[PDB]
Amino acid sequence: GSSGSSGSSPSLLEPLLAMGFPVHTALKALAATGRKTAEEALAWLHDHCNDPSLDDPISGPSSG
Fold first, then answer.
1. 58 and 21 in contact (C-beta within 8 Å)?
2. CA dihedral for 32, 56, 43, 5, sign (positive or negative)
3. Among candidate residues 10, 24, 59, 19, the one with its CA nearest the CA of residue 39
4. Which of 4, 12, 39, 64 could form a disulfide bond with 60, CB atoms 3.0-4.6 angstroms apart?
5. Pairwise CA distance, residues 55 & 9, whole Å
6. Could you state, in order of their start, the residue ranges of all structural domains in the chain?
7. Residue 53 DSSP code
8. Closest to 25 (Cα-Cα) out of 40, 7, 41
9. What does the radius of gyration of the chain's CA atoms come to, in whole angstroms?
């Protein structure tokens, strides 16, 4: 249907949640990647989580 802003039920968050990532975060990666797929979100989180502007518990690599 031509529904709008219809995304209350847990769909893409399921995987982004079971992995450990919260909601506010999992949502950012989703909207960023374009709600294409759970994996996509991970690719955006692994590249974002590693930044001084994005304070999160997601501990990165030694250097990063």
1. yes
2. negative
3. 19
4. 64
5. 27
6. 1-64
7. T
8. 41
9. 13
Residues counted in the chain: 64
Structure tokens at 62: 């030694």
Query: How many angstroms separate the CA atoms of 58 and 51, rounded?
Result: 11
Please name the amino acid found at residue 3.
Answer: S
Is residue 38 within 8 Å of 13, Cβ to Cβ? no
- What's at 37, amino acid-wise? T
**Exposure of 16 by Cβ count < 10 A (0-12 exposed, 13-18 middle, 19+ buried)?**
buried
Structure-determination approach: NMR
